[PDB]
Coordinates of N, CA, C and O and ligand atoms in Angstrom, one line a residue:
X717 N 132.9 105.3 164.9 CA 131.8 105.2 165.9 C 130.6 104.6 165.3 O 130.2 105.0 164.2
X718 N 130.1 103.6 166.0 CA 128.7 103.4 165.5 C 127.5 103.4 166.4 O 127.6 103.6 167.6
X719 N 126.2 103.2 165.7 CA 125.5 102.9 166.6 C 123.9 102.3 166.2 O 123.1 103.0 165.7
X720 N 123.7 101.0 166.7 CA 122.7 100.3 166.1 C 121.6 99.9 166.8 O 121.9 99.3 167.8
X721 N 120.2 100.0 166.6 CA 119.1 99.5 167.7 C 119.0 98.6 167.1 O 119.1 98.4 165.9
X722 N 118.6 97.6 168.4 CA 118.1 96.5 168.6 C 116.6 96.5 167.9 O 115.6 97.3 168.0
X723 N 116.9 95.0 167.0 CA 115.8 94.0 167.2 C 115.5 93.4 168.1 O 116.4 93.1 168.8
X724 N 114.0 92.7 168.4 CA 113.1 92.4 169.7 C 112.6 91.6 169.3 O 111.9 91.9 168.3
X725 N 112.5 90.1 169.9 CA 111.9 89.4 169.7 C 110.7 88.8 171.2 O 111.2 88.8 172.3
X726 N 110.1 88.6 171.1 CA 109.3 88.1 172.3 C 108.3 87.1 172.2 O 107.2 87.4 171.7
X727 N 108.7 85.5 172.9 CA 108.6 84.2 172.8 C 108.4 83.6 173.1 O 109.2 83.7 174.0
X728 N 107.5 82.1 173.4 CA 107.9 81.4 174.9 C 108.3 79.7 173.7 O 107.9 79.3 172.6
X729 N 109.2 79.3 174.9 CA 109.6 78.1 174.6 C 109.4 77.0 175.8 O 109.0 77.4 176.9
X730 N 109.6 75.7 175.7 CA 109.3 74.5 176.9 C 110.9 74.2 176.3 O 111.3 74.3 175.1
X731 N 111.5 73.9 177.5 CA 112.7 72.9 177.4 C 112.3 71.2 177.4 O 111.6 70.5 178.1
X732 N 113.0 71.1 176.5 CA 112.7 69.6 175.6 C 113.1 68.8 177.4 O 112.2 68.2 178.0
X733 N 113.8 68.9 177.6 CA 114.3 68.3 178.9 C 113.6 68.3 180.0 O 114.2 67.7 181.0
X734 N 112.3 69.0 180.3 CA 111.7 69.6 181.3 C 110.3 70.2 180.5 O 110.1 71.4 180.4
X735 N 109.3 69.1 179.8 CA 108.5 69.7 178.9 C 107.7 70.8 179.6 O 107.6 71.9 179.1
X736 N 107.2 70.6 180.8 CA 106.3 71.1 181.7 C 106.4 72.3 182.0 O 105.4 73.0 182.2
X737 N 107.7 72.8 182.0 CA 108.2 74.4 182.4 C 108.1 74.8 181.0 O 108.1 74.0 180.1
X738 N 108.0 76.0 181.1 CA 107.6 77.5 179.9 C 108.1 78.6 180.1 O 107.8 79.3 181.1
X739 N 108.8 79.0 179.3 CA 109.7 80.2 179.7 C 109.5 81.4 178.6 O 109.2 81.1 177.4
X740 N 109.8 82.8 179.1 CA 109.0 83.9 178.3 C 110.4 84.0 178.1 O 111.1 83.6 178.9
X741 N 111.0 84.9 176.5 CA 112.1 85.1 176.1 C 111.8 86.3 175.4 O 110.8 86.6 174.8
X742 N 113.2 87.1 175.7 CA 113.1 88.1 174.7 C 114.3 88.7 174.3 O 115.1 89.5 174.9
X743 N 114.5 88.2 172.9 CA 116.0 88.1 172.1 C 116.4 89.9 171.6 O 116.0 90.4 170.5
X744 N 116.9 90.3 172.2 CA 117.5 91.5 172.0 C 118.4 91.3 171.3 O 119.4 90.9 171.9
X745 N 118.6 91.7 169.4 CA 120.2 91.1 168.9 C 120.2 92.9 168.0 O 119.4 93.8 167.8
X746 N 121.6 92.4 167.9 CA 122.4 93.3 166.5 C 122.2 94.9 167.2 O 121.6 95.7 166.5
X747 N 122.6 95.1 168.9 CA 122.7 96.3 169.1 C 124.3 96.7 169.6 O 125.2 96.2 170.2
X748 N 124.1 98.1 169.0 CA 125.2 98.9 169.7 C 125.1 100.8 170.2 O 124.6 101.8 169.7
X749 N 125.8 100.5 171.1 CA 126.8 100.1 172.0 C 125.7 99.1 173.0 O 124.5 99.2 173.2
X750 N 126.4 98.4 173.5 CA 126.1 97.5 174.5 C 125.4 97.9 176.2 O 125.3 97.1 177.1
X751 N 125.2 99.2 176.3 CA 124.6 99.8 177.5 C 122.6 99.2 177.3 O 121.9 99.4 176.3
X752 N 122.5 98.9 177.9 CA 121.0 98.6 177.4 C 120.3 98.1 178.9 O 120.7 97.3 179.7
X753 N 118.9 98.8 179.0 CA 118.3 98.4 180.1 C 116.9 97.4 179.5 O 116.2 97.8 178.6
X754 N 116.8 96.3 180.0 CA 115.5 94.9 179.7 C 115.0 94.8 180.9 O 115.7 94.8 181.9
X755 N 113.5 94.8 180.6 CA 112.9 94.2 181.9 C 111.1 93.4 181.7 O 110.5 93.9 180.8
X756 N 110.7 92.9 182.2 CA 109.2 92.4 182.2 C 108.0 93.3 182.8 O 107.9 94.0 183.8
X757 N 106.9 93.0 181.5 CA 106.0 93.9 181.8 C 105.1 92.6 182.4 O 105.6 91.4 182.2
X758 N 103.6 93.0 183.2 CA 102.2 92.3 182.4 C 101.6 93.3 182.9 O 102.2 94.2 183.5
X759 N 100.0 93.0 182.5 CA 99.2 94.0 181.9 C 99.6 95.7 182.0 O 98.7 96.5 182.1
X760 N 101.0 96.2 181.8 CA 101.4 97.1 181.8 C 102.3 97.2 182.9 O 103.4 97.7 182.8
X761 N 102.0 96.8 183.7 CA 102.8 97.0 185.1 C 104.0 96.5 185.4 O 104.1 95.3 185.2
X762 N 104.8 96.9 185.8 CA 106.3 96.1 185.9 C 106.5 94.5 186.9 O 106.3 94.4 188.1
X763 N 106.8 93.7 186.3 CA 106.8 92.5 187.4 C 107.8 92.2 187.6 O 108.7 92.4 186.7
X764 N 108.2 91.6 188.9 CA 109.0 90.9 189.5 C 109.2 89.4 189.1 O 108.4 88.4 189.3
X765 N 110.5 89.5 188.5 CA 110.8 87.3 188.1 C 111.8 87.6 188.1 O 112.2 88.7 187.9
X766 N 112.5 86.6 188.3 CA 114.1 85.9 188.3 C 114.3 86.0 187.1 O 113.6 85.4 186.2
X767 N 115.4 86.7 186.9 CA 116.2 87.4 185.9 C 117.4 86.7 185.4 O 118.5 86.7 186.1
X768 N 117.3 85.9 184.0 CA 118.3 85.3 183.6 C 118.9 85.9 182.0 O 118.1 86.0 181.0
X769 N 119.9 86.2 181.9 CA 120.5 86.9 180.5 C 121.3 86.2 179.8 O 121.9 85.4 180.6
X770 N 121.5 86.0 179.1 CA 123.1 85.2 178.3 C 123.4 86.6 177.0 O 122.7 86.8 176.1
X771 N 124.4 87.4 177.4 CA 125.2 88.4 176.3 C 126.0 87.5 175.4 O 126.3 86.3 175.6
X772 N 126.0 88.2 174.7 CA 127.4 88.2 173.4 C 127.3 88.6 172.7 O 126.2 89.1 172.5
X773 N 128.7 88.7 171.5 CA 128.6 89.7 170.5 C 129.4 89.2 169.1 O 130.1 88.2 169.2
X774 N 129.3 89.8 168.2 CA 129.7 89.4 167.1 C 130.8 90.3 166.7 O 131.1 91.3 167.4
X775 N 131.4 89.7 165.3 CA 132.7 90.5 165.1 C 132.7 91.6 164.6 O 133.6 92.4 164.5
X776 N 131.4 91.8 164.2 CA 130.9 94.0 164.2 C 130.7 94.5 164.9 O 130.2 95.6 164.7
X777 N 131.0 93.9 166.7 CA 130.8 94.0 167.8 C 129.1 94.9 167.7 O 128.6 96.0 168.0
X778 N 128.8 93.8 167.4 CA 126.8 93.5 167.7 C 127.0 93.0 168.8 O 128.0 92.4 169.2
X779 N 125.4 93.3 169.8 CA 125.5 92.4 170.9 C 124.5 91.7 170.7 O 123.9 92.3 169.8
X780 N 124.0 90.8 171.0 CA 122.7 90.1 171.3 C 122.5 89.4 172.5 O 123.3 88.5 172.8
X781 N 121.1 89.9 173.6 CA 121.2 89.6 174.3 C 119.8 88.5 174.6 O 118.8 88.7 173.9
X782 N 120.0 87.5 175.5 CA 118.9 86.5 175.4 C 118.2 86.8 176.9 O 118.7 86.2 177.9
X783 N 117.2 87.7 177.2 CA 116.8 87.8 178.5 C 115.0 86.8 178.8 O 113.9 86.9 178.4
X784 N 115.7 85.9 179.8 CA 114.7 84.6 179.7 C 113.9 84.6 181.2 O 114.5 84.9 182.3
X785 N 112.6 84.3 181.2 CA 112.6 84.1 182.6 C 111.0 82.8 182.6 O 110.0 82.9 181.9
X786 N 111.5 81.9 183.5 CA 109.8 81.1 183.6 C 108.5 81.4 183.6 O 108.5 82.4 184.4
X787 N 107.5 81.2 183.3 CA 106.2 82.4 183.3 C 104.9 80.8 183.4 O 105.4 79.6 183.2
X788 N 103.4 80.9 183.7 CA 103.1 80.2 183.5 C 101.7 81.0 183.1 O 100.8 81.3 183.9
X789 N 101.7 81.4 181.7 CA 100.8 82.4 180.9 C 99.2 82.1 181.1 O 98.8 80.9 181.4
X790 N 98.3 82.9 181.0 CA 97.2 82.7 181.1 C 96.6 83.5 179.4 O 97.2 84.2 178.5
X791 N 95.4 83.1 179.4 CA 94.6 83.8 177.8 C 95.0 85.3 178.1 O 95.7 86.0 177.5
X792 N 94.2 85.4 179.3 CA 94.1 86.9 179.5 C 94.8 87.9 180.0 O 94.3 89.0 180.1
X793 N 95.9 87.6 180.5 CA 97.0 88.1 180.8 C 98.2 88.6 179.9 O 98.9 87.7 179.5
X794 N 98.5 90.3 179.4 CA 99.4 90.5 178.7 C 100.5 90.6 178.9 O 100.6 91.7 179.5
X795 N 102.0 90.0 178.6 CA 103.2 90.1 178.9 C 104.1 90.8 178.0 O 103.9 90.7 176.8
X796 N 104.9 91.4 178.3 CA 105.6 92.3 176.8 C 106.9 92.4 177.9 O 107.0 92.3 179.1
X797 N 108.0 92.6 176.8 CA 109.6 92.7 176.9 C 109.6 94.5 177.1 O 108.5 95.0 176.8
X798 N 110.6 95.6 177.5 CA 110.5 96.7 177.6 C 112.0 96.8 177.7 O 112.7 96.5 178.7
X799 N 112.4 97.3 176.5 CA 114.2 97.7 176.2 C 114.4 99.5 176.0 O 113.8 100.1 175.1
X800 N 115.2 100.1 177.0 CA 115.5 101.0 176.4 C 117.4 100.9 176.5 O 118.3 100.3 177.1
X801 N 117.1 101.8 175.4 CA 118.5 102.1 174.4 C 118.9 103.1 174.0 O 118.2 103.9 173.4
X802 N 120.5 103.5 174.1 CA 120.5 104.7 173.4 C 119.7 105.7 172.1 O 119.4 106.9 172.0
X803 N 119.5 104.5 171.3 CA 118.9 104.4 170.0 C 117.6 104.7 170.3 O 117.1 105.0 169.2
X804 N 116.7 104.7 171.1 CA 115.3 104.6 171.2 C 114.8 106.0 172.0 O 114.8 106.0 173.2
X805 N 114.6 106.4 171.7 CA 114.2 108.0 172.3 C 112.9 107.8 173.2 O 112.6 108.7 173.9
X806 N 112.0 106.3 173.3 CA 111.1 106.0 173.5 C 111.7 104.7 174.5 O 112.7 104.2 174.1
X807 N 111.2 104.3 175.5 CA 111.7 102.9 175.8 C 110.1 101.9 174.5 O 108.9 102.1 174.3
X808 N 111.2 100.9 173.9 CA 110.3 100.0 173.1 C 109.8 98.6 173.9 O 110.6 97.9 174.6
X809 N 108.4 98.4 173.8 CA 107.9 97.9 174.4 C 107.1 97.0 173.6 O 106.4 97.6 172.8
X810 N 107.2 95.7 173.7 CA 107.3 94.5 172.7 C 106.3 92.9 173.5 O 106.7 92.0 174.3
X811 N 104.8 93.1 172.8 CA 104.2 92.2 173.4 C 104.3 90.5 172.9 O 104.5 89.9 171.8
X812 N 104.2 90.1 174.1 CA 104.2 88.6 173.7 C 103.5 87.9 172.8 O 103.7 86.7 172.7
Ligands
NA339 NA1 116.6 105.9 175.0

């Protein structure tokens, strides 16, 4: 049996293809077991966006998960990633 928490990353990228869009990311890798709840914060509060993920896993059956969604950021506005996990006794909450 094992069991491993997640690293968190939280990002934004432009797709080379579409410079103009900006997308907030947040790379959840090298966790196990694979039961895991992700979602978007701003200024603390839970928001509503279109929810896009891409899973997979490696041959130590790690998962890493890529949970992506469009955003169009302001100075003053705070966004953060919010994963809980078996592993996390706390849900971990990870600013942009
Ligand atoms: Na937990």
């Amino acid at each position: 049996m094992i069991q491993r928490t997640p690293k968190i990353q939280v990002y934004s990228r432009h797709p080379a293809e579409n410079g103009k869009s900006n997308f907030l990311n947040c790379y959840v890798s090298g966790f196990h077991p694979s039961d895991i709840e992700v979602d978007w914060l701003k200024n603390g509060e839970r928001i509503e966006k279109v929810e896009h993920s891409d899973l997979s896993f490696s041959k130590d059956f790690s998962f890493y998960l890529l949970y992506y969604t469009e955003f169009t950021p302001t100075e003053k506005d705070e966004y953060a990633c919010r994963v809980n996990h078996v592993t996390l006794s706390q849900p971990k909450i990870v600013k942009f």
